[PDB]
């Protein structure tokens, strides 16, 4: 290594720096704040009563953690977004539009589509971003005598604009609304379906709805790759005697260097240092006499590196320390010198 560094098939007596000692991280420590408030999806999807399609109902979701696993867990088509990535997104608002339609009308709840629902009851924009969820509610909404509570608009003088609602009863130049009359004896296409449309609003503004995050256990006194609520870095985590104020999340040294953090879940303060490192020097007599070497790890502890002698300059390995005294030959530091001696 020394010969290559100096570009010589020969090495003269002395001490040379040829490389660097660095400890690598062995784990990945991910820590986030635990959810305290959760998005009320349960109170939208498990409701006893749904609105008529001519008079669709909008519920606003905000200031909450959006756990979408349940929706996956129990029709589920997402536009502009993947249903498996919703867990790691943030939104400025989420809007849930609930209504009841026939099974054959489910295809109309989509961007670019037309029909008497798409045009007169519930219109989505061509650039719609969000997910459409629907399921068969025949067991709950259908009645033997006929369920006439659900209505749709058949007549209007014009088509609806995206997310427009029209619940007027003015006579069409016909009475504009007509019942579904749902029954348990109908084939699937004529059975009732409960539809919830989740619109995802993304603006240049602070998010109010965010999905949850994956986290791991805390590891201390080891070299790890860590992330505390977005606060990225590499190093060794230890306890701390720092007195943080109730609002402070992390601290920095005089060099504006992060040197302490607050743990999002345990609210404890941890000190941060870089993983052990230092220069590596090779001590050798001239290659004209001997090919023996000794290695000094500068500023490194002999228990960190993995004839072992600990000195103020670092850990010296390969040289035998003696209690004799000679003239200095190859100097190391702090009063210590090395030499090639008598076998």
């Amino acid at each position: 290594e020394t010969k290559c560094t100096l570009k010589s098939f020969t090495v003269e007596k002395g001490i040379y720096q040829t490389s660097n000692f660095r400890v690598q991280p062995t784990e990945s420590i991910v820590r986030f704040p635990n959810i305290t408030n959760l998005c009320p999806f349960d109170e939208v999807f498990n409701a006893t009563r749904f609105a008529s399609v001519y008079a669709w109902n909008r519920k606003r979701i905000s200031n909450c953690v959006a756990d979408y696993s349940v929706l996956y867990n129990l029709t589920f088509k997402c536009y502009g977004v993947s249903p498996t990535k919703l867990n790691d997104l943030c939104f400025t608002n989420v809007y849930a539009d609930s209504f009841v339609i026939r099974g054959d009308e489910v295809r109309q709840i989509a961007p670019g589509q037309t029909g008497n629902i798409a045009d007169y009851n519930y219109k989505l924009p061509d650039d719609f971003t969000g997910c459409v969820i629907a399921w068969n509610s025949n067991k709950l909404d259908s009645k033997v005598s006929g369920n006439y509570n659900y209505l749709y608009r058949l007549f209007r003088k014009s088509n609806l604009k995206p997310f427009e609602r029209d619940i007027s009863t003015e006579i069409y130049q016909y009475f504009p609304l007509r019942s579904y009359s749902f029954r348990p004896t109908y084939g699937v296409g004529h059975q009732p379906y409960r539809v919830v449309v989740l619109s995802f609003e993304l603006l240049h503004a602070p998010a109010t709805v965010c999905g949850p995050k994956k986290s791991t256990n805390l590891v201390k006194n080891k070299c790890v790759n860590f992330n505390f609520n977005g606060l990225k870095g590499t190093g060794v985590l230890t306890e701390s005697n720092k007195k943080f104020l109730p609002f402070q999340q992390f601290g920095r040294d005089i060099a504006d260097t992060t040197d302490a953090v607050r743990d999002p879940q345990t609210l404890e303060i941890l000190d941060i240092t870089p993983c052990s490192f230092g220069g590596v020097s090779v001590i050798t007599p001239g290659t004209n006499t001997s090919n023996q070497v000794a290695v000094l790890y500068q500023g490194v502890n002999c228990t960190e590196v993995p004839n072992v002698f600990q000195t103020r300059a670092g850990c010296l390995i390969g040289a035998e320390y003696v209690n004799n005294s000679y003239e200095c030959d190859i100097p190391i530091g702090a009063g210590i010198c090395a030499s090639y001696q008598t076998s």
Epitope: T36, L38, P40, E43, V44, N46, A47, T48, R49, K59
Partner: antibody, heavy 126, light 101 residues
Framework: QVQLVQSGAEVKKPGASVKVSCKAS????????ISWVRQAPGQGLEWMGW????????NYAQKFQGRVTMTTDTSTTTGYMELRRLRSDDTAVYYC????????????????????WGQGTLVTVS | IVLTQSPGTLPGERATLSCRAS???????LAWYQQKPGQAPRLLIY???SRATGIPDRFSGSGSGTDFTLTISRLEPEDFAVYYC????????FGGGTKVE
């Protein structure tokens, strides 16, 4: 692993009020409401009222409309009920339960029931 | 809405309990409870049909309109308890309670 822990038995005089607590754990407090039901000796279950842990909205049974007050504390995830002007006919065991019959955020009816119940607090008036 | 239950008082045999409403109750708004001696009531059936978590398969409910029932396919020694019907279609009420003995 949902639990509801209520206070112990109380003995009151006629005209006195009683405060009954219910500590909740094992679930997100603000995701579910709190309901109260009482059962007098030899009698069935009588609904007293409901409160939302999210927005403080209440729905009381007519029988206690002017007598019972319900509150919540989200920092200690504990529900509270106070019944004023106690009479001898109010001797009963008062139970708390987790409410999944009405939404806490929207106030709309849900498909469910009272799944988790506390042990019940016995209140005697004499 | 008033809920009337019968019989007043009813191992290995099949049991049926009835609850009749004075007014129509949606299936989505009806439930059944069980109360053992010395214990708080527990939820058995919700939506008139679905079982609550932890409830044995021998317990099943059904009904429509004003007439709902709870059936136990086989009575076990631990199934002897007071059962209640509930509705929250209008306000929230409980039935009188029916005893299995």
């Amino acid at each position: 692993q949902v639990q509801l822990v209520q206070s112990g038995a109380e003995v009151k005089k006629p005209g006195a009020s009683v405060k009954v607590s219910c500590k909740a754990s094992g679930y997100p407090f603000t995701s579910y409401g709190i309901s109260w039901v009482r059962q007098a000796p030899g009698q069935g279950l009588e609904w007293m009222g409901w409160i939302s842990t999210y927005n403080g909205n209440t729905n009381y049974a007519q029988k206690f409309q002017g007598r019972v007050t319900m509150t919540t504390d989200t920092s200690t995830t504990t529900g509270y009920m106070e019944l004023r002007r106690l009479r001898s006919d109010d001797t009963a065991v008062y139970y708390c339960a987790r409410d999944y019959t009405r939404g806490a955020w929207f106030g709309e009816s849900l498909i469910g029931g009272f799944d988790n119940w506390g042990q019940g607090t016995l209140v005697t008036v004499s | 809405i008033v809920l009337t239950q019968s019989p007043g008082t009813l191992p290995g045999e099949r049991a049926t309990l009835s609850c009749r409403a004075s007014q129509t109750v949606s299936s989505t708004s009806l439930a059944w409870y069980q109360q053992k001696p010395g214990q708080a009531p527990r939820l058995l059936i919700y939506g008139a049909s679905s079982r609550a978590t932890g409830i044995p398969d021998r317990f099943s409910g059904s009904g429509s309109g004003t007439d709902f029932t709870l059936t136990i396919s086989r009575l076990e020694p631990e199934d002897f308890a007071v059962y209640y019907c509930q509705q929250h279609d209008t306000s929230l009420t409980f039935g009188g309670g029916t005893k299995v003995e």
